[PDB]
Amino acid sequence: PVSPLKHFVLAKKAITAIFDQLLEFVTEGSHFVEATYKNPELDRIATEDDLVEMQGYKDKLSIIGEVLSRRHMKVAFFGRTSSGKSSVINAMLWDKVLPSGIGHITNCFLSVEGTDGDKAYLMTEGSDEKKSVKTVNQLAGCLVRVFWPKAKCALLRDDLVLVDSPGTDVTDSWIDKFCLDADVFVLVANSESTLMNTEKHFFHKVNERLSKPNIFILNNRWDASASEPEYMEDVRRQHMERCLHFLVEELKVVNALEAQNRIFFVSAKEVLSARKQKAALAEGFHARLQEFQNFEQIFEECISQSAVKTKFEQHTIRAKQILATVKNIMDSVNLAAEDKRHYSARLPKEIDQLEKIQNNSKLLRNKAVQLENELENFTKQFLP
Numbered sequence: 138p139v140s141p142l143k144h145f146v147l148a149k150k151a152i153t154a155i156f157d158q159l160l161e162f163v164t165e166g167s168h169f170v171e172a173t174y175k176n177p178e179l180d181r182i183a184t185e186d187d188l189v190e191m192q193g194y195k196d197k198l199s200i201i202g203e204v205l206s207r208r209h210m211k212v213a214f215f216g217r218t219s220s221g222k223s224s225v226i227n228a229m230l231w232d233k234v235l236p237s238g239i240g241h242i243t244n245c246f247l248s249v250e251g252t253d254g255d256k257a258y259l260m261t262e263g264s265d266e267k268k269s270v271k272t273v274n275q276l277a278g279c280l281v282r283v284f285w286p287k288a289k290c291a292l293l294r295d296d297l298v299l300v301d302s303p304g305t306d307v308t309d310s311w312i313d314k315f316c317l318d319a320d321v322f323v324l325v326a327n328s329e330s331t332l333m334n335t336e337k338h339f340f341h342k343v344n345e346r347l348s349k350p351n352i353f354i355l356n357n358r359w360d361a362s363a364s365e366p367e368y369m370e371d372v373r374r375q376h377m378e379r380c381l382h383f384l385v386e387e388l389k390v391v392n393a394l395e396a397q398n399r400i401f402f403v404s405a406k407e408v409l410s411a412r413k414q415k416a417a418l419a420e421g422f423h424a425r426l427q428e429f430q431n432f433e434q435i436f437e438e439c440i441s442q443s444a445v446k447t448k449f450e451q452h453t454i455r456a457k458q459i460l461a462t463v464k465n466i467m468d469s470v471n472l473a474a475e476d477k478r479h480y481s482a483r484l485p486k487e488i489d490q491l492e493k494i495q496n497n498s499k500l501l502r503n504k505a506v507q508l509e510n511e512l513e514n515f516t517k518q519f520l521p
């Protein structure tokens with residue numbers, strides 16, 4: 138069972154390798170354009186504008202590679218205090234990463250990301266110090282970053298970052314600082330209550346600022362109706378009706394069939410206890426566990442596909458534009474050299490020098506075409 142998050146990992150590896158090659162190619166092409174422009178025996182074969190363009194591309198292709206190397210998937214959890222946001226995150230991480238009662242006292246956002254080390258730690262905004270996660274109660278707009286060993290959670294190994302927000306009912310400017318790059322928003326609701334307008338309004342604001350945000354609703358604490366099956370079915374219908382209407386008719390972010398794959402009824406407490414033990418069950422436990430596992434699979438499929446487009450499409454488009462321009466420059470150099478060869482070149486040494494320029498510009502043009510093909514292959518595989 139291969140995690141869908143590997144789609145993102147593979148896309149990130151592919152696009153970073155393309156940009157490594159692109160930087161090397163533009164560096165080589167810039168050296169060629171410079172030598173051609175600077176040759177005192179050549180007039181107007183490569184222009185000063187040709188060189189400035191190539192150097193400008195060279196000067197900015199490195200930071201694209203470094204920026205791409207740090208791209209990650211991000212899921213953000215929202216909901217009323219004690220709905221179960223921290224517990225859902227812990228269940229997905231298979232451990233008690235965010236401590237008990239942290240939701241009572243946290244007024245900062247808490248993010249969880251992977252670390253290559255074997256020791257968990259946290260970092261605050263104004264330093265590089267790695268602090269004990271045992272101080273997270275003291276440290277928790279503000280953001281506290283929790284780092285958890287990648288060897289312990291496959292989600293973190295596969296470049297997912299999970300963000301816990303302060304309770305919606307006791308606090309937006311949240312969107313700008315910690316939501317412009319979130320790929321998925323998860324509303325955690327208390328299934329013993331009813332979906333509230335305070336929660337709806339927040340996702341209305343996300344919806345107005347982002348084009349078709351990916352939104353899941355987890356009706357948590359579903360174990361509270363265990364052994365009440367007839368009751369459970371009717372409460373499920375009522376929650377489903379209200380959650381469907383919100384996603385489909387109010388937000389209009391999903392049609393009614395796809396909405397079935399965005400609303401789930403779960404017990405994060407049961408799931409965490411089952412998973413911490415893996416490293417006398419209430420009635421319906423396994424059905425609820427299976428529903429949480431189905432949510433995780435659908436969530437991973439959603440966020441991996443979505444994040445590849447969101448995080449990598451613009452730079453893929455830019456790389457194609459850079460290559461088209463470099464090809465145009467190589468075309469211009471070749472054409473100017475060949476024109477000169479046939480219009481006014483006289484001595485066989487001048488002719489041989491122009492033929493070398495033609496040949497090297499063609500070698501570079503063909504290298505650009507090969508990188509265009511790699512970008513087309515990337516687009517076909519990763520950018521539907």
Ligand SMILES: Nc1nc2c(ncn2[C@@H]2O[C@H](COP(=O)(O)OP(=O)(O)O)[C@@H](O)[C@H]2O)c(=O)[nH]1
Binds near residue numbers: 225360404
């Ligand atoms: N019965 C039950 N209790 C839960 C569930 N999820 C969380 N809780 C409990 O509800 C309390 C608050 O949960 P927490 O995850 O801290 O809520 P948060 O404030 O939204 O982060 C804690 O005591 C949890 O143990 C659940 O699925 N079922």
